[PDB]
Amino acid sequence: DVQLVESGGGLVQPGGSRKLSCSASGFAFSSFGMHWVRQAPEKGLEWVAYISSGSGTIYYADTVKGRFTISRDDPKNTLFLQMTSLRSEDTAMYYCVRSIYYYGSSPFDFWGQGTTLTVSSAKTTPPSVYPLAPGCGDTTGSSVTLGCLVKGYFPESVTVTWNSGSLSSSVHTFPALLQSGLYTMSSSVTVPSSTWPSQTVTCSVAHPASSTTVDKKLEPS
Amino acid sequence: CGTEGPNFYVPFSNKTGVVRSPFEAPQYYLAEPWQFSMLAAYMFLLIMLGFPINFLTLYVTVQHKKLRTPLNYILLNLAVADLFMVFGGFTTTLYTSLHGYFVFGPTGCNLEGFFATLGGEIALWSLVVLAIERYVVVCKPMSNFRFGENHAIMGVAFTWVMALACAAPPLVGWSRYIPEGMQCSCGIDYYTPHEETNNESFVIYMFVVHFIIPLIVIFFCYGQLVFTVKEAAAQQQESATTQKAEKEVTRMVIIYVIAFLICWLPYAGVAFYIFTHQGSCFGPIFMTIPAFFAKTSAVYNPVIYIMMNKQFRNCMVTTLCCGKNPLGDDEAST
Amino acid sequence: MLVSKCCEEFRDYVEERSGEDPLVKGIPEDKNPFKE
Amino acid sequence: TLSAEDKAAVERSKMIDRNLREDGEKAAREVKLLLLGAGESGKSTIVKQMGIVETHFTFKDLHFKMFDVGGQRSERKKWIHCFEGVTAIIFCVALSDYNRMHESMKLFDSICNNKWFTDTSIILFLNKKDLFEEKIKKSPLTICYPEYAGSNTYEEAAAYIQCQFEDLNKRKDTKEIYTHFTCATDTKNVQFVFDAVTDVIIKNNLKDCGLF
Amino acid sequence: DIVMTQATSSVPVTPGESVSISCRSSKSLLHSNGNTYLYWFLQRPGQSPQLLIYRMSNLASGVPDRFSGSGSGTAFTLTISRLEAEDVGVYYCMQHLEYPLTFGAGTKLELKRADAAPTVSIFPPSSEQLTSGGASVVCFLNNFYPKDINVKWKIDGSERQNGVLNSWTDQDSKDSTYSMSSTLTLTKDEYERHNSYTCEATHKTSTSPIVKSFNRN
Amino acid sequence: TLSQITNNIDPVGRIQMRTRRTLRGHLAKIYAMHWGTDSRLLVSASQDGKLIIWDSYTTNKVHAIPLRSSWVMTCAYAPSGNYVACGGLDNICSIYNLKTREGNVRVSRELAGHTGYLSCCRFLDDNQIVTSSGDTTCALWDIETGQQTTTFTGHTGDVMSLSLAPDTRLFVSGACDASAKLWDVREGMCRQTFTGHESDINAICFFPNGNAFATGSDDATCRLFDLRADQELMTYSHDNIICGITSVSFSKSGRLLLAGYDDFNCNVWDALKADRAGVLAGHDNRVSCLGVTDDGMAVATGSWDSFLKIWN
Ligand SMILES: *[C@@H]1O[C@H](CO)[C@@H](O[C@@H]2O[C@H](CO)[C@@H](O)[C@H](O)[C@H]2NC(C)=O)[C@H](O)[C@H]1NC(C)=O
Ligand SMILES: *C/C=C(C)/C=C/C=C(C)/C=C/C1=C(C)CCCC1(C)C
């Protein structure tokens, strides 16, 4: 029934501005109140903004009172959130949240799909992906794990598959970390010493900002 | 002809030395004391008549819940006008009549004149917008208008606006409040030659705003209304009850015309003749008369509106011995 | 089964109900949201 | 001490109460032009150029409403007990298919000064009054009435119908009955009832605005 | 402002038993109206949160009745009668007494299993990583329990502090394990100056640190 | 009898019913109102096409519901707290579902099939509904699918209103030929018929144990009745009043009795000593229907005033 499609994510230059929109459909947009809520990376969540029925009553939190703007457009079912003076400490996923208030009524009881806002000077960079394997005097037992390390990039996320997705359980995937502000992450697969060198196994990196997919076959010493 | 002064002006001869200010001395040296005696006696009569009607007015207002319609607020504002005048115009002048002179100074003069003239103006605009609301309800001159409570409350707002439009200016020195005529009354200068309080501007303002415009709009609304009832009663040349309604509508409109004209037309006649005959001299007995009939008109303002509305002159049927009005449950169980 | 018996039954239900009724027993205003 | 979190819970009550009252705005700008009677009542050509029934016909800047039942002495308890605010009793009556006249006598005795709708405005339309002038001569109305005390014409006939409505009135004064002498039924009646309801709303204004 | 208080991480409860998670307040959150205005949220990973308990006392739509709430005037605890395989994830407390609202801090509900063996792997940088200059020696560590673990780095036998980065996955539920990878970010000279290199892992499951090594020779 | 057996009961005193809460809002006559079940919410039905449910504690408007047809004679409220039930003239028994729908409250069943006007409706649970119309007959229904499951006959006149005893399994009926009949809900053979009035009976309710009831009528002569006895038990009549009595509802203890009249008062009666126990003035117009809560804490009146009043 209910579709709360966010729109307006992506990268924002610091101290700048951006509008957000929740395409709302399936529910009578008049008699509800909206809440904007924010979820930081690996932090506790936090309340931002309230608008009521009747489009008048407006509340903010501490740090963004006076710099954010909440409004609703009832012929367009549309929650506008204009943010101004955006800084790195609000790089977060936001949600827009349905509400309804009276006695025996249930606030917050639906949630959006969420969207990403990222405040950095980080330009979009094609990454550098590297294969990892045994070396010079490095000897072989039964099976060997073989890994791919992607370093030095910025979308928020990249992806990597394996021979266009040819194995799932032996692949593990280590999430990312900042280093000089550059994202870095890795993933891995483990194969026996018989299946390789006898088969072709290729890690496959997609870069969803610049749309760049480079594939690397595993190689021995 | 007269005698000036800083706060006082008496139109009487001070070549015989007898003129002193009524802040200073009793004014029996020009008037008979029995004049003041009979004046005080009929002031006593009119206060005794004019208070209990406003008493039972607000008592029948609050007690019977049927009556606080959007079509009845202006009778309540007229009752406020009569209450202001009964409290703050009458007994103070009665007090100074028992003295035969004034005792309160120009500050108490400003007070007493403020209360009295403010009540008079509120009564004026009560008459005005009663006429306007009956015009708009019966005629519908603008296409697609209908009446809510909000327009009546905005009307009461307009009454207080036109109240302030007169009660203010002698507070800010442009033409002041003084004792006046026989000086037992306080009010506004309008007849002493003095451009320093800038009198003629306030004369034009008062005359046009508070007398010409209201007279215009009451004759306008009542002409359109009476001709409308003539047209409607002409559409049905065989209804008796519509022709009844025609006759008592004509009767009551002509009654309100007579009442309003007697209520104000003397003051306009005074300013009329004096500005017509600029520089003329008179007596304070002469000048006293129109204010006397003005406060008399403040007495008969319940007579024309309150004491004759059919829906509301049930009250005097139920008043003259006891009191019981519809929370007495005229129910007629069938 | 005649009437006075049933009326005694009606009694016997009415009797031990004053402690629950907030009207006949009446009510203190702190024990009612009807303060204004 | 109630300044706690319910500043939507009263704010909702403002948002619902404004749209509560603004339903009353386009209430009563219309009036309710109500169809009554039985068969042969002559309101089919009325409703021709014009649940149970409504309509929405307008003429000269005033939208109208209109509703319909029929079959008196059993449909009475409907509208005496649970109608309201009628400005138009269209008491269309059959004139050659009657009986159903003491129907009207005891009905108008029951309605005229009972506490719910003493203040009704009962307007008769002798629809197809040529059928009435035919019926009173083919059948002298002394069959229905003992006290037929007039001549042999239409004026005292229609006036005596107006009598025998209000002959069981017995304590009141008037109704101001707007008897359209109904012509050949494709006739201009919209103007008739138009300024008729104009005069009834004018007298409803003046009864409630001081001037009588 | 008013502060909610939780415990951050918690015991993996065994799938099939009850569990209880608390949160308490920096003020008496009960108002004179009668009911304390408190909110218990569920969030699954990679998802969007639906609520569990509105106003401290009541389950919501589309939630089974195993989420029995418990309330004082000040301290509050949600009790689950049985941990099913799908109530995994993060829990939040969030009061609703005044504006603005702060939330809790998050508390994780996990899965409990046996011990597991740390699977170890060492990797020196191959040739194009060598041409990158700042080398990258990695050590992978898989399928072990819990991810509380320690890593030692004897570079020419020397327990090097700098250049050590660590990264943990979440509870990979295809085998209910954890997996951690650590890199050794190096320069050119930090690579060339030494000869011997050891990763040494220490997990709870034994006293023996598992060693993996190589030599630049 | 009751009356000559009442020789043991010490009197009750005089108790002030203080007019606590005044509900504004309406614009027309109000033909109907009825409660929640946690003694807090109140449905209310008035002539101007809107249908209002209410939180009497904090005294503010909770919902107003559009109808498409502007004629009401009843409304009931489901003891879940999810279904409102609005009737009418045009036989469209409109069931609206409150909570589970998101935003709206729209119909899920228009029970159609009654010939004449639909007089009263009462809920059992979220399943069924018992209804009474002008078709001389009444019916139990099944709103899950819309089949008129069971329908009972017997009268010669239009039905006016209908009543439950809260163990949900008996019902009793009132119709314009001065008839009050008993029907067991499930089977419903023609059990027994009740006379004693001369008027079309206009209200009836049940003594909350489940053993007796009482009828109020506009011939100003209320009565009380056993489940078995078929004759008069206790007569209720101010000898000085001949304007009739529009609605009736017992209090929680069964010590009291409400009645609103045509002279715009609600006399509160002792349910024991046949006395005027007290008086309720303040009504602008005639008391349409009055309602006691489920604990007898408050009591409420809806009248033609376009207002509701809360007595304590
Ligand atoms: C009227 O004029 C007379 C003089 O013609 C004034 O009388 C004098 O007033 C002053 C001050 O009050 C006294 O000092 C004199 O003694 C008075 N004259 C005599 C002969 O006694 C009188 O003040 C004037 N009155 C007014 C009101 O202006
Ligand atoms: C108790 C005394 C009362 C109510 C008198 C009040 C006086 C006025 C409202 C003023 C009237 C005029 C002027 C002196 C100047 C212009 C012409 C008039 C008639 C408006």
Numbering used by the authors:
A (entry chain H): 20 to 240
B (entry chain R): 2 to 335
C (entry chain G): 31 to 66
D (entry chain A): 4 to 53, 183 to 230, 241 to 354
E (entry chain L): 21 to 237
F (entry chain B): 29 to 340
What did the article's authors report about this structure?
The photoreceptor rhodopsin is one of the best-characterized model systems for studying GPCRs, providing invaluable information on how receptor activation is translated into G protein and arrestin binding and activation. Rhodopsin has been shown to interact with the Gβγ subunit of the G protein heterotrimer to assist binding and activation of the Gα subunit. Nanobodies, Fab fragments, and mini-G proteins have been very important tools to overcome the inherent instability and flexibility of these complexes and obtain near atomic-resolution structures. In this work, we present the cryo-EM structure of the signaling complex between bovine rhodopsin and a Gi protein heterotrimer, stabilized using an antibody Fab fragment (Fab16).
